[PDB]
Design a protein around this ligand. Sequence first.
Ligand SMILES: Nc1nc2c(ncn2[C@@H]2O[C@H](COP(=O)(O)OP(=O)(O)OP(=O)(O)O)[C@@H](O)[C@H]2O)c(=O)[nH]1
Ligand SMILES: [Mg+2]
Ligand SMILES: [Zn+2]
Ligand SMILES: [Zn+2]
Lengths: 181, 141
Amino acid sequence: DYDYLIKLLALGDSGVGKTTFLYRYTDNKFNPKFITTVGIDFREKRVVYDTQGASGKAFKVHLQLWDTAGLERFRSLTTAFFRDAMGFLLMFDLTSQQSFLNVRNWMSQLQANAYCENPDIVLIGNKADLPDQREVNERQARELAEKYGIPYFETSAATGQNVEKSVETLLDLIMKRMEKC
Amino acid sequence: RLDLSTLTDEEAEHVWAVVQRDFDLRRREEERLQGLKGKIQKESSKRELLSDTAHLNETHCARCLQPYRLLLNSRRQCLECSLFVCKSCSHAHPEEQGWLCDPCHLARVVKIGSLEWYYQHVRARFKRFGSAKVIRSLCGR
Ligand SMILES: Nc1nc2c(ncn2[C@@H]2O[C@H](COP(=O)(O)OP(=O)(O)OP(=O)(O)O)[C@@H](O)[C@H]2O)c(=O)[nH]1
Ligand SMILES: [Mg+2]
Ligand SMILES: [Zn+2]
Ligand SMILES: [Zn+2]
């Protein structure tokens, strides 16, 4: 029961917090346990999307949130599911310049296994709640996000900081794509 | 080819599960679209029949056929097919001061909902979708 079925997927390094980010989005809770995701997994959530015009109309959307593994032992398998999504949450950790340098590898990885070369994407900086342990210059992350012509959001699965916002931005990004049919 | 031998079995067993759920999902989404496409043909053919019953839309809702004077809401024109229908059979559409008739509304959820643009670019770049590919590869057991 719903009007639209939208498929999304989160990819990044292991431990940058994708499973946790997604759980916070569909459960508004926060589980601290790290149990590296085995290959793939996905959670579903029904949501409402309202339109703009000038008012507009409400629409029931059924989200399929794809959560890929970060490890390389699985790189092969994980990338297979990249074509199964309309939009991506490309996230890195704010507390690891490393994961931020891998963001460039991921992008290309996406470009080759997605349904298109330029899918709707949104760059995500996770773990904002720990500024004392932060190591990624905000300007770079913000500039890289402008090189790709992509929205950037510093988030926190913990505080929930923007977790909701970012996701509903990718969504709205995909909704503009569909509507042009 | 995607080579899953590396996968230990507890893992293998897990992946498949996730994949099953995906297939369950796909099945459901195709039947959801079928049903709607079914509703558009039924309602559409009804129009093609009553089409020879002079000026019926003037007094009766184009969808439920109930008489206007008998309702508690107020007649509306579909911004699309410009026929009138009661409040209950109408819907306020996305971008424009106005409304849409229950059929025209489904007609639109279906055109956007199917996502032809997406599934065709997907189909033209790979031969099958993720779970599919991963299913034959998981057959190597
Ligand atoms: N303080 C804080 N900790 C977080 C946040 N997000 C995730 N974590 C923690 O970081 C760890 C990793 O989160 P995961 O979801 O397992 O990260 P992952 O990248 O999906 O793991 P993989 O599936 O192997 O790629 C967890 O044990 C969480 O406790 C956050 O926003 N704030
Ligand atoms: Mg995880
Ligand atoms: Zn009616
Ligand atoms: Zn109409």
